[PDB]
């Protein structure tokens, strides 16, 4: 059941160098007298690892919740075995299952449960002089446990219930690693007689257990036994004591290692391949010794930093202002059409104008048409009542749709409209606008009908002059300025887009970035797409030529669409790294050559040599570098 621990005086956690520590047997395979390469989660060599304390001098003890990352390397130098085990999980709060280890002299209890872990998880351990023993008085680790799914008891560990002193005579160290719902554990124990810290020498952890737990892990926390000694009040204001233990945490990560297995089937030495250039050389040769010489070992390669895209100036804008800002619009029965072709259409000036009362598009979203292309666009335009703007859409009906202007049911254009009673309304009405009130039949899509002859309303066969059942087919609108909004004039434009087998000629504008030079960049010049270093040029193309090619028929120059300048393209496709070694019998220092790159360091014909001094004194060649240049080990 849960309690708290006093919030405290403390110091920040320290760091220490891991040296060679934290190697473990990757596989249950016997291999003897052999060097084997493997890519696995390891603690990389010489890593700084966090050092934590558990000391009552004041009151600095350091068991936060910590990340698990890819996996944990843990170590302890021994005390009262103050570390009792660990909890691992995600939410820790019963609602997600978590793994508990507790490592008691009675039982190594291993449990997965819906543990409700505390504000401060610990074992309350009291010196029961009542019965001449220390004992746990209190499981202050959790409030409740439920749905456990797994439990195990292993044999009582090399760790004890009493206020003992291992006094750093032993180093206990572990790897914890969760993969595919299998929680692996590894460990080793080792006598030490250093003062403190991780020792230099090599050792391998053996497998300790694997638990098929399946549960989510993200975080962990170390569990401590806290000394409610008889001098303490036995409360949680101050009725506890921390002892004086120390523990270390490092993290695994993906690394390639080379392991030396001896005759007895034991790992005895290792190389972290990614550490330094000699480690990469040993890992390349699959050997722990390297003879005097030069070894090709890796490839250098530069990556593009930016993408530029660049297209000719935006200039030939389509005539929309001549349609929308026109002075005289048509009567709807005799609607105008204008045909738009061979231009850059910037629809943005339409679709985010605030002026229009209606704006909507069918088969196309405004979020796409500024990057779309068409053979032609038609703009149809006319004036109608505010009510009738409803009917200018697919599948509509009534006098305007059926006798004046019919859209296809599968239309792919836009309808735009705005109120006007300024251009096109005055006292007595402007009667200059008309519509068909009568026809024998409905229009087909985009039909027009200017025909002006008397509509015979069925009965009374009519000899071409108006009368009863025989009406003139057009009516004129009463566009008074004081009309209600449904009877105000509205100017309308319908933009119909189309595609045929003819090439596209109306298209949205193309954006250009700035033009950048002397960096490796990705680029797109007017559709010509690539990656390289752009620089000015001495080439002289003919006025119509756009890009150059070499004798191998690959692109080596280009013209800028917006300034007509010629640019050379050069590849950043470098290669080759080599390590120069006096032999490991002689020394562990090395020099490195980058095979052909503009940068001690020392540029040469054969690329830039790094890490060795150039010297004017000639000698015979110890190790050959490039173009009459050699390297040697000297005072």
């Amino acid at each position, epitope marked *: 059941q849960c309690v708290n621990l006093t919030t405290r005086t403390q110091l920040p956690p320290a760091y220490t160098n891991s040296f060679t520590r934290g190697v473990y047997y990757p596989d249950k395979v016997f291999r003897s007298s052999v060097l084997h390469s493997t890519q696995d989660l390891f603690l990389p060599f010489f890593s700084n690892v966090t050092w934590f304390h558990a000391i009552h001098v004041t009151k600095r003890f350091d068991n936060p919740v910590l990340p698990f990352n890819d996996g944990v390397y843990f170590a302890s130098t021994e005390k009262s075995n103050i570390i009792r085990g660990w909890i691992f999980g995600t939410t820790l709060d019963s609602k997600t299952q978590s793994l508990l280890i507790v490592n008691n002299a009675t039982n190594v209890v291993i449990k997965v449960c819906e543990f409700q872990f505390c504000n401060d998880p610990f074992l309350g351990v009291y010196y029961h002089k009542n019965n001449k023993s220390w004992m746990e008085s209190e499981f202050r680790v959790y409030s409740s446990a439920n749905n456990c799914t797994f439990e195990y008891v292993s044999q009582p560990f090399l760790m004890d219930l009493e206020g003992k002193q291992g006094n750093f005579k032993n180093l206990r160290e572990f790897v914890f690693k969760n993969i595919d719902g299998y929680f692996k554990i590894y460990s080793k124990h080792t006598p030490i007689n250093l003062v403190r810290d991780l020792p230099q020498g090599f050792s391998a952890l053996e497998p300790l257990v694997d638990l098929p737990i399946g549960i989510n892990i993200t975080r962990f926390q170390t569990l401590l036994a806290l000394h409610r000694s008889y001098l303490t009040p036995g409360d949680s204001s101050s009725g506890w004591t921390a002892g004086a233990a120390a523990y270390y945490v490092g993290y695994l990560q993906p690394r390639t290692f080379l392991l030396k297995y001896n005759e007895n089937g034991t790992i005895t030495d290792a190389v972290d391949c990614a550490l330094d250039p000699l480690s990469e050389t040993k890992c390349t040769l699959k050997s722990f010794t390297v003879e005097k010489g030069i070894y090709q070992t890796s490839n250098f390669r530069v990556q593009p930093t930016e993408s530029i895209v660049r297209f000719p100036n935006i200039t030939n804008l389509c005539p929309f202002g001549e349609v929308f800002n026109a002075t005289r619009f048509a009567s709807v029965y005799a609607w105008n059409r204008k045909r738009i072709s061979n231009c850059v259409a910037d629809y943005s000036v339409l679709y985010n104008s605030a002026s229009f009362s209606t704006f909507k598009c069918y088969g196309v979203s*405004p*979020t796409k048409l500024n990057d779309l292309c068409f053979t032609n666009v038609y703009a149809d335009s006319f004036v109608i009542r505010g009510d009738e703007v409803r009917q200018i859409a697919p599948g*509509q009906t009534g006098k305007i749709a059926d006798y004046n202007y019919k859209l296809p049911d599968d239309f792919t254009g836009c309808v735009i409209a705005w109120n006007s009673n300024n251009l096109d309304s005055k006292v007595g009405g402007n009667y200059n606008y008309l519509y068909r009130l009568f026809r024998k039949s409905n229009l087909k899509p985009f039909e027009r009908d200017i025909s002006t002859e008397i509509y015979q309303a069925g009965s009374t066969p009519c000899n071409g002059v108006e009368g009863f059942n025989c009406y003139f087919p057009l009516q004129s609108y009463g566009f008074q300025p004081t009309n209600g909004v449904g009877y105000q004039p509205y100017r309308v434009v319908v933009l119909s887009f189309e595609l045929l087998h003819a090439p596209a000629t109306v298209c949205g504008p193309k954006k250009s970035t700035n033009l950048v030079k002397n960096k490796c960049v990705n680029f797109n010049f007017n559709g010509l797409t690539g990656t390289g270093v752009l620089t000015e040029s001495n080439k002289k193309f003919l006025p119509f030529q756009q890009f150059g090619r070499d004798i191998a028929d690959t692109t080596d120059a280009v013209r800028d669409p917006q300034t007509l300048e010629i640019l050379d393209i050069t590849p950043c496709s470098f290669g080759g790294v080599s390590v120069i070694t006096p032999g490991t019998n002689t020394s562990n220092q090395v020099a490195v050559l980058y095979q052909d790159v503009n940068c001690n360091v020392f540029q040469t014909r054969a690329g830039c040599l790094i890490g060795a001094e150039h010297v004017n004194n000639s000698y015979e060649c110890d190790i050959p570098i490039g173009a009459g240049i050699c390297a040697s080990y000297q005072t």
Partner: antibody, heavy 118, light 111 residues
Framework: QVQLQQWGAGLLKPSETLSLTCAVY????????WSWIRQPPGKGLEWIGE???????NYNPSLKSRVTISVDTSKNQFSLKLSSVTAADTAVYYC????????????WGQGTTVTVSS | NFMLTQPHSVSASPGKTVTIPCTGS????????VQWYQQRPGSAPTTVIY?????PSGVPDRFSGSIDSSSNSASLTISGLKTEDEADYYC?????????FGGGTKLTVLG
């Protein structure tokens, strides 16, 4: 992709001035409509006002009298001031993007609570 | 000026289908695009219909928009209700340099 993160003074008292900032990651102010919307506790959304593409401003006539909205492109940040606050200004406030004048509220800031209390 | 109105609440049993109406008033709803946002409690809204018929990427095809100028109304149909559909739904549209929202409808799936 684009993120909006917002912050400001969540607790006020009557007749003070409210002030929020919203800042954009992975995107740029210039091309889009940027807008403030509020939601009183257990009530429908109310649109306050907006910046258009290129940074001119438009406000709801019911709040026009006591609202101000402004950008600093050097921070990728924009902001709302609402003066003379009363209990009725208690709400959650969101910033949001719109691609074009009549288009959707495309992406939203995480929302921030404001309590105006004496 | 122009207002969208919605029923305050809607409910039906899971696996069934419902319509939420959004009625235009003082102007014509068909004249500009309509959007529907879902807000699940304690979070920012999200779009489910982004022009009168159009459904965003990743939105279940259970969600389906519609409009008619004859009722002066839009409506959202959710077909095959699930536990996760229980939320507020707001319609929205541009009017006259103003974005207008409906009052929002609570949908519950009738467990």
């Amino acid at each position: 992709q684009v993120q909006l993160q917002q912050w400001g003074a969540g607790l006020l008292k009557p007749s003070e001035t409210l002030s929020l900032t919203c800042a954009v990651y992975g995107g740029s102010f210039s091309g889009y409509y940027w807008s403030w919307i509020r939601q009183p506790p257990g009530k429908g959304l109310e649109w306050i006002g907006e910046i258009n593409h290129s940074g001119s401003t438009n406000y709801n006539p019911s709040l026009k009298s006591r609202v101000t909205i402004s950008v600093d492109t050097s921070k990728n940040q924009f902001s709302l001031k609402l003066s003379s606050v009363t209990a009725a200004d208690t709400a959650v406030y969101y910033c949001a993007r719109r691609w074009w004048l009549r288009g959707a509220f495309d992406i939203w800031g995480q929302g921030t609570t404001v309590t105006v209390s004496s | 000026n122009f207002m969208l109105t919605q029923p305050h609440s809607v409910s039906a049993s899971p696996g069934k289908t419902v319509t939420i109406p959004c009625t235009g008033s003082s102007g014509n709803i068909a004249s500009n695009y309509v959007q529907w946002y879902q807000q699940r409690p304690g979070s920012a809204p999200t779009t489910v219909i982004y022009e009168d018929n159009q459904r965003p990427s990743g939105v279940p095809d259970r969600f389906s928009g519609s409009i008619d100028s004859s009722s002066n109304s839009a409506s959202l149909t959710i077909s095959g209700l699930k536990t996760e559909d229980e939320a507020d739904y707001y319609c929205q549209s541009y009017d006259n340099n103003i974005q207008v929202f409906g009052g929002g409808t609570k949908l519950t799936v009738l467990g």
